[PDB]
Amino acid sequence: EDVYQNFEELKNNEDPSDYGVVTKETGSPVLVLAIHGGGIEGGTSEVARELSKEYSMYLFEGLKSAGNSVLHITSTHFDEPRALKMTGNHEYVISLHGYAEEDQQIEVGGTDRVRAADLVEKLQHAGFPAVLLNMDHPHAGVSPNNIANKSKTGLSIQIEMSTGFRKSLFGIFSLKSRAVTQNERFYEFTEVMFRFLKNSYL
Numbered sequence: 504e505d506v507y508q509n510f511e512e513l514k515n516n517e518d519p520s521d522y523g524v525v526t527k528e529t530g531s532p533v534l535v536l537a538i539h540g541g542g543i544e545g546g547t548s549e550v551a552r553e554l555s556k557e558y559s560m561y562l563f564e565g566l567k568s569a570g571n572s573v574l575h576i577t578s579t580h581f582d583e584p585r586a587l588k589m590t591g592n593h594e595y596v597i598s599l600h601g602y603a604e605e606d607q608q609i610e611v612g613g614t615d616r617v618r619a620a621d622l623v624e625k626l627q628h629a630g631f632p633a634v635l636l637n638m639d640h641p642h643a644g645v646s647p648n649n650i651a652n653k654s655k656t657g658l659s660i661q662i663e664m665s666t667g668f669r670k671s672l673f674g675i676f677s678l679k680s681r682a683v684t685q686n687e688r689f690y691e692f693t694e695v696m697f698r699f700l701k702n703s704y705l
């Protein structure tokens with residue numbers, strides 16, 4: 504159970520300095536969506552920002568020194584106005600999440616079954632620990648109420664990265680230092696994603 508039921512409630516309860524909405528609009532068919540950025544799901548801000556070099560980006564970040572968990576709003580409740588605008592303006596959505604787990608794992612779901620399966624094969628071939636989630640899996644992200652699915656097509660890829668995988672990409676795993684300690688494994692991962700996105704969306 505999240506602390507807030509929707510963005511209007513979070514905005515009325517939290518100091519505006521303690522979160523940030525960040526957008527990059529390029530006209531790319533694909534939107535990179537990270538609604539749990541900053542301290543909420545650590546490392547999702549950095550993966551989103553690197554992919555935004557080629558793709559449109561929506562980022563919601565928790566910027567508290569601690570207690571960013573209160574800023575988590577589940578995808579089916581996430582209705583921040585700039586997110587509703589940007590998802591509606593794009594053909595396809597890749598949505599970035601973190602979940603709690605020490606082992607290195609990437610769970611791939613979403614409504615775009617063909618591209619989710621292709622992404623898992625490319626990650627596995629490239630030596631990353633990806634599994635495809637199917638429609639009855641809890642992390643599937645197939646709800647029409649899911650922010651990632653409110654696009655022109657309703658086709659999404661949901662990328663859920665374990666704590667262990669996210670911690671593997673940074674010298675220092677802090678709000679302050681992830682963005683300036685990205686390692687060789689961070690660029691190898693984002694290169695596989697750039698390779699996949701250029702090929703899979705034409």
Ligand SMILES: OCc1ccccc1
Binds near residue numbers: 557694
């Ligand atoms: O310069 C960042 C970047 C890396 C790989 C592909 C596209 C862009």
